[PDB]
Amino acid sequence: GFCHRSYPPECWPN
Numbered sequence: 001g002f003c004h005r006s007y008p009p010e011c012w013p014n
Contacts, residue, residue: 003011 001014003009
């Protein structure tokens with residue numbers, strides 16, 4: 001559920 005605002009934004013199924 002927690003996504004990191006990177007580029008590309010890395011998000012995990014958390």
